[PDB]
Symmetry: D3
């Protein structure tokens, strides 16, 4: 058992259900540690497919990165050991398919989390927002790259620059989702596909998944390029605007961004 997730097994399929509704399944360190422990505990030959879900009837699938766990300024908010950075790597390297089964609204790092998973099947009422520009956070290269493998650049830029929610129907049309189903059909539609995958050759699925992962990451740059980007990110996490974005969230008010 786990404090912040609940696991059920049906034949060869494991379903990991978030249990952190008190913070709307925000990706806090202690929540992600339990999610990672539950995945590791399910890395055995008789489990063939994972489903990630929020509880049935959830308004909010996940509120994204825990804003309270972001640093106050002057520190990189999305360093390699950050919980969002850990969970996306672990999903992508996990040698079984991971299906995100989505009911409710999806925010920021939770949208990156489901994008990092293998398939996304969603309720017709689910919504999707990418929100770091609401807070002034300099998103990291790996995080942004994880958003670019489904929908086109123009679509990704609209999502990130507007931070406006999109419907499940629009997320299907642009290539983000695999399927959209009525919420009463979501569980059994997802499980039917997970059990079907579970009869296929797991060692073949694992090596093809890993081949896709390394091909997806195979956009290479030189050290100077990376250090230049990192210096720009540093100017953002050093900015007055970053402090304003954090404070506006704390004070539950609209931020006033000024470009320094």
């Amino acid at each position: 058992a786990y404090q912040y997730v609940n696991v059920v097994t049906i034949n060869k399929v494991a379903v990991i259900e978030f249990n952190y509704g008190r913070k709307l399944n925000a990706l806090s360190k202690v929540f992600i540690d339990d999610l990672m422990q539950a995945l590791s505990d399910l890395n055995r030959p008789e489990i063939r497919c994972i489903i990630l879900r929020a509880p049935s009837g959830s308004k909010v699938f996940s509120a994204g990165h825990d804003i309270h766990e972001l640093p106050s300024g002057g520190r990189d908010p999305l360093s390699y050991d950050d919980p969002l950075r850990q969970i996306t790597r672990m999903i992508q390297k996990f040698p079984k398919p991971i299906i995100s089964m989505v009911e409710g609204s999806v925010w920021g790092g939770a949208f990156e989390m489901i994008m990092s998973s293998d398939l996304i099947i969603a309720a017709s009422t689910s919504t999707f927002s990418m929100t770091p520009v609401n807070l002034g956070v300099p998103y990291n290269l790996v995080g942004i790259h994880n958003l670019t493998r489904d929908a086109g650049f123009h679509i990704v830029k609209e999502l990130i620059f507007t931070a406006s929610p999109i419907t499940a129907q629009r997320a299907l049309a642009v290539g983000i989702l695999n399927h959209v189903v009525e919420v009463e059909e979501l569980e059994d539609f997802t499980l039917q596909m997970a059990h079907h995958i579970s009869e296929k050759a797991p060692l073949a699925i694992a090596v093809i998944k890993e081949e896709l992962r390394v091909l997806g990451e195979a956009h290479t740059m030189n050290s100077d390029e990376f250090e230049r980007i990192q210096g720009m990110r540093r100017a953002v996490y050093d900015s007055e605007d970053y402090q304003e974005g954090m404070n506006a969230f704390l004070e539950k008010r609209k931020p006033n961004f000024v470009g320094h």
Copy 2:
């Protein structure tokens, strides 16, 4: 003439029609060698556009890899000079547009083959499946990469991990196909597009096709990461599951995969 293909030329357009229906146009070496010779023989200045097709009324466009040519020994059947690997390189490097004109069901290696071509125009009743997880085959990096340039990562993973067929209408919606036409209109729709292309500048088409080819290949990795993937593939070829997948297909029974 050719034993396993038929070629027709209409001014600047050449049609290469499969003639291997006895074996559902399975990608046997003798068939691929004839397709490659026919293409090589059409690399002439007065030919400007190629169409690949199965015969009119075909239920099966191509059944994919020939099971009888798949070595149960160590030997990787997706090594550099295996016929499927040769013909996808040849299609990609060919200095004229190649249009796949699809009637019937497309499977496995034959799906990769049409994905390697420049345009796909399909009958409304055509269907598409990617099948190596049905046999436990560790599909090779180049081969997987060839499936990633049209539909997004979530869609590709659904196709590969489920091995479930999709309709022409879904293949159009996700970006695999250019056009879906009623079967009675397929040949004329495809020919008029090929004749139209054939009035454009062939040297410009050739260099822009080659620029697209090298940009599409330009996902680069270090030697250690390639050798690490090859070790994983060899472990799949050495598995009990790989033996079970091939024997099950030969014996017409459901495989029992166990994950070693």
Copy 3:
């Protein structure tokens, strides 16, 4: 302040309107130089979003490359400091979002230009063509790469090899456009989004845009592959077909290409 563009500032949004309609906003050096000056002049903290547009009611958004500036004797017109190559770099490096708000027909280099921008919102009557195979132009690697980040490879090759126009509805369906609206709604829809973006954290927007730019460019190749492609491009520029394509456009007649 500018001969060939008009600028209007509405709160934090700047609308740059083409003023070269007597040449259908063809990408003449004098026009592109004024566009780049007006954009540079808008790189100030109190400007948060840019819209590029043709005048209200335009039949032609932009006619693409100016034929009279296309060099006969040798010179690559798609060299690093040619105006279209300069303006696409400037648009992609500009630290504010740039929305192309499209009314009318978009051709060739102007299609690349709007594809280089962050979002494209188009009138339901707008049309889109990529035309270099009409003239035998060997379009350059960077220019072709700029066309590959939205729609898939099969679609891009149809657009380039046919040089046929596509509707706004098809451009939306394949992932090229963000939104298609009735022409009467184009300003309201586009400005509402631009004002919304202008509420967000500009430094986070700038660094994410730059991360996407560098990831988009991170398709790397060795020097030999680049030099090989440049030799193929030079052979097209030296071709009789290239002379025929320019002469036919200048004489308002159908080119007859011969493959040398």
Copy 4:
């Protein structure tokens, strides 16, 4: 304790002495497994510097690959989890400096092993050979890469194509070695340098070592190039010459190579 190595710790320096004289420290699996276990056991905060050595007075440092373990069947003997391949990765990823202290003759795989280490200090009488062309072995990319970071290409090609031994004085002159010492001063000299390194900041040493490792490995190629090299290597291990080289080595006779 270990069957095949002896470990001595002197404050922050650990000396791992080979104890496989029975087979002249040939890189047999049982010897390399003990060497890797000993290194792993020494990955502790209070150890700062490792020395690898053969016993004092040894005429042979290491005879290289155990040829009774290079399979004359079909399998690649330089696959990712071959002992030589494992030990070079472990040495390069180890977060402390590893110094090869060499007395005696160094052969083939043992030469690659010391080249993968951080520093090489050698007796004036030690000799160095790289021997795969004696046996017809298609050495792997990673393995060859590990020989290219010290001496220039022409020097490396002479070593590999001739398989001739070089002196310690020549190995110093071409940049393979750090220092050449009289044999009676070898241990004192090496330990003095190891104790000195051990006074420096270990976390800085570890991150700079890892920075050099990844820069060393950052020669990137596409999947097709790697698969093309893989197919060339398979042709070599399938050759008559490969069987002849292994047999001639086992039978202590000169091989007769014929180019197939």
Copy 5:
């Protein structure tokens, strides 16, 4: 004129002489800002070659990083816009040859600075060391890469891991220096070579220098590798050892490093 450098021009050669002897030409921001202003001022077609030198008779060429300008902990000490990072880029991108003419001892960042120049001519009495491990500084990837284009990996690792000085004779032997000459001959020898270079084709020198720069930079990696390295560097600049290294330098005592 400049507070912290003296410039003389002799025909087409400019000599930039350090004037910061009271701080042993440590790389303080005020010194580097003046050196960069002097270089920019000399980017003129009548200047063909630059010499960087310390005053005649200098015991210390440069004491390297100003440790009063090292941030205290929690902050990256070698960010993109830090003075040493700016001057190495500026040296590398400068379209004229820059010759480091070395008299005296060279330390740490000053060693990286001369390595970033095009040629190094040194007095027989000059000495060179690379010192970050003395303080626990996590040297950045670009800075380490600048140290790897002359001497081999084993030699570079000895220099960095020991922080021990090498002689001009050994620096010549391992490929760091171009020439070593008696101090009395140093100015005349270096000026003769700079005048010689100044009669060659400056635009050919400039493009070949730039080709070398981008080839030297062209070791590429994926974003995850870069961010993993940055995470490791941050753990070092967050360490108690980093604070102890800085404190011990300011208190003029031997540090006690413990590995956290």
Copy 6:
């Protein structure tokens, strides 16, 4: 038989001797075409090693590029299919070792040509110069890269920026040469080594040479960086200085370069 070379084979070693002394073995197209034909003719299983040499007693091994064949019209003289560019690719791809056996002075493109070969054995009286800065030629990326795999960057920049000759002794010290011998020992020493190599496994030598070639080329850049370099090289071939450099050479006087 060949007009511009003489070939002698004994056993498994072929010697290709230049026969173009009346033009100092200048790299004229007719000479390089004959060298490439003779190499192609020797790509037979019973030939195992090639030696390239000038006749015994040659003062000039090769005068490099024929200045009569360098275009003054605005054509790149180092385009992909230039004879020097062809022969360096052919030497590097050739599946046998190629030894340059040098007597006499080596200039410009001939220096690149011997650097592209696998080993260099030289007379003690031989000399080496790299001269494009004498004529104002913007040497191409591939050609510069071919000069960077033996000596370090500082040495390479001295050779190129000074265009000054270096002795065989210095060429040996800096890592360019394998061996320097007295001229009366040059044939015997080189034949001994070539016949020794010919007793080794040719398929292993061929695949290791190809692995080295691919690793050597695996310095990758994005399209924008290559196109930016191309633009710089074009500005050099459009220069007053490039005309002055070719005119001075034809008129047998010193050029006056001005930086335009």
